[PDB]
Symmetry: C2
Subunit: 49 residues, 2 copies
């Protein structure tokens, strides 16, 4: 007997993903976490922890 | 005598345009107005006032 997730993971293009998906021909995955790396807190070296 | 502005208008790529400028290589003038019409009021017809 093992443990595991009961459902799939959702990915919805709601929010600021939708503006770049309509205006340009592209769309991120997790725009919000991708934005907090660049502009909210720059020059931070990647660390797995 | 005439009366005009005293300074330039300032356009700067802030945190929502800066992600699409770095990642996609395409930016946009006034992202917040594009976002406040596509996702906030999608059915609003273009009026002048």
């Amino acid at each position: 007997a093992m443990s595991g997730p009961a459902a799939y993971a959702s990915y919805v293009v709601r929010g600021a993903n939708l503006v770049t998906a309509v205006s340009y021909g592209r769309a991120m995955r997790n725009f919000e976490q991708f934005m907090a790396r660049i502009v909210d807190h720059p020059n931070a070296l990647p660390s797995v922890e």
